[PDB]
Design a protein around this ligand. Structure first.
Ligand SMILES: [Zn+2]
Ligand SMILES: [Zn+2]
Lengths: 167, 170, 85, 85
DNA sequence: GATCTGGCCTGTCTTA
DNA sequence: GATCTGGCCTGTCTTA
DNA sequence: CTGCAGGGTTTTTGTACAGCCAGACAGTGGAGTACTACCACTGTGTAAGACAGGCCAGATC
DNA sequence: CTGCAGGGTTTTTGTTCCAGTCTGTAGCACTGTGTAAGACAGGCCAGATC
DNA sequence: CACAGTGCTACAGACTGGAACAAAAACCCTGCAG
């Protein structure tokens, strides 16, 4: 899988880790056969329910996973409280609960999710670092002023239109 | 031209390890908070009849190409006092704005917009801390539901979203 | 002196640290009026011997500091081993 | 990884380079001075014990105590060949 | 009982 | 003697 | 074959007429141009070891 | 004289293919921005009662 | 099923040439017409 350890885990190492063939390199580690089958099956369940909340608009792009999501989550939770209970007896991570409970509801309500993700914010932070070096003034007083301005200019459509150069 | 509906996704997230400048003053913490928004869609309704009608929808919302910075601060996420002190006015214009419809001169003509604000971009710890919850590992896990830790242990796949602003206030 | 506290001493904060002004700003702190004289005169000695090595070619740009270096360092060392020992 | 580079330098010092420049081939001699190291690394490449060691000076043989007694009088000894010996 | 050595733990220094 | 409550440490968890 | 010397060859290099368009010169009053200091203020130096003294552990007699 | 039919005309405009030559893009395996606190449970010693 | 890239690669696309075909444009023409 060509992966290297992380302190805090970025979502990129999460995308390499979540894949089935990633669960393959670990399936080889666990001596027990039925365990080896169990977590594998778990991961395929997860690949089936992930695009629902990851994809921008599942109502079109991935309909069948969406309609089967409730049943699929049921199956998932069953498998957890079945073979893994020792680690889920009295404790569940906030997100595993949130993703196994309220997803179908909010996708029904907003119409879609993941288009609303923090990603469109967050990413922007990268800019805030470079715009604090390249385009900064630089002194404490004016710095936020010209970062903010230059950022605004970066974001505008009017310019990007020009930078497409019409094919 | 007067029946528009504008849906704006706003997001606010913090950032650590930003080194202070020698500068003059005043003394300021290292961490910086970036408050932004993005226009997800703009649609239409009138004459009446049909629904609301999409016109423009951001094709790649996740791109950093469209995220519009608004409030830029040096604030530690942990101190609430200052965070609410600076973000107070901003929220005030929002909840004052939801009521009133905008009038712009565009395409030559005077037209009117309704704004629908959805803050969806906040991380769980921030949602919790602006909503007054106990973060982040407290017995009550769901921001959207009333389930405790152990209660969400036995039962999982069946839950009903309750938690909403007005309810939290009351 | 408009200088934030530091992690690690970087050379820039190291240039704004040793100047007569910075020392006269930290002169207000130490109550003993003999010591003010001491560390202050110390810093001036240092400012006198600093351009010797730090300048590109001291033979031209700072000759008089150069010719006085040994003696200057002598007053310096005598001041340390005496007062700061 | 820095072994080959050193072998380059040392083998290079005796030879003179011939470069065709301005239309005419010409012969250059190279004199290498490594001056830009931090001491920790100076101490490494030359085998000196580091960096808080009783023997402080890379260029001199004085201990901490003897450099405390007489500060301003010293003679540079340490160089490559003697260090090998 | 009580050395010696080495130990860790502290504990400061100097470069980084 | 021996509760109580807190206090700190520890202990894993859980978020960023 | 070399050396130089009358002229050949073709080709340069410019002067010769005479008319004529272009843009520079010079003015202006100042326009708004373009390039200038100046102002605080920054970024890159980032981890080990040596050495002293304690003193308790524990082997050795 | 007109009207349009259907030919004359030159002259656009492009046509098929084989050597190549330049130019822009997809293929590569792969990267950046998410970074700090508290909550809950259990044990147990301290320390105050009495 | 985040997204703007990350350089150098890959060879996709952009070019000629005569040899000749065809279609179309917009004239002139003559034809058959009130
Ligand atoms: Zn819930
Ligand atoms: Zn020395």
């Amino acid at each position: 899988m060509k992966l290297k350890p992380v302190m805090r885990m970025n979502g990129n190492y999460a995308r390499r880790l979540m894949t089935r063939e990633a669960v393959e390199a670990v399936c080889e580690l666990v001596p027990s056969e039925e365990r080896r089958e169990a977590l594998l099956k778990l991961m395929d369940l997860y690949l089936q329910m992930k695009p629902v909340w990851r994809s921008t608009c599942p109502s079109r792009d991935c309909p069948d996973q969406l309609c089967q999501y409730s049943y699929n989550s049921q199956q998932f939770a069953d498998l957890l409280s079945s073979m893994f209970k020792y680690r889920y007896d009295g404790k569940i991570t906030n997100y595993l609960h949130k993703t196994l409970a309220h997803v179908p509801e909010i996708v029904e309500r907003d119409g879609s999710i993941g288009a609303w993700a923090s990603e469109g914010n967050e990413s922007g932070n990268k800019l805030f670092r470079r715009f604090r070096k390249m385009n900064a003034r630089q002194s404490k007083t004016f710095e936020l002023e010209d970062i903010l301005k230059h950022h605004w200019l970066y974001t505008s459509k009017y310019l990007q239109k020009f930078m497409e150069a019409h094919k | 031209t007067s029946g528009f509906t504008v849906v704006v996704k706003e997001s606010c997230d913090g950032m650590g390890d930003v080194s202070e400048k020698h500068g003059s003053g005043p003394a300021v913490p290292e961490k910086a908070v970036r408050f932004s928004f993005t226009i997800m869609s703009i649609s239409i309704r009138l004459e009446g009849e049909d629904d609301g009608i999409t016109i423009f929808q951001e094709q790649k919302p996740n791109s950093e190409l469209s995220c519009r910075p608004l409030c830029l601060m040096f604030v530690d996420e942990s101190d609430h006092e200052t965070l609410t002190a600076i973000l107070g006015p901003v929220v005030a214009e929002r909840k004052a704005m939801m009521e009133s419809r905008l009038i712009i001169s565009v395409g030559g003509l005077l037209r009117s917009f309704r704004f629908f604000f959805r803050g969806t971009g906040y991380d769980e710890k921030m949602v919790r801390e602006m909503e007054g919850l106990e973060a982040s590992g407290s017995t009550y896990i769901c921001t959207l539901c009333d389930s405790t830790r152990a209660e969400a242990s036995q039962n999982m796949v069946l839950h009903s979203i309750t938690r909403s602003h007005d309810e939290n206030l009351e």
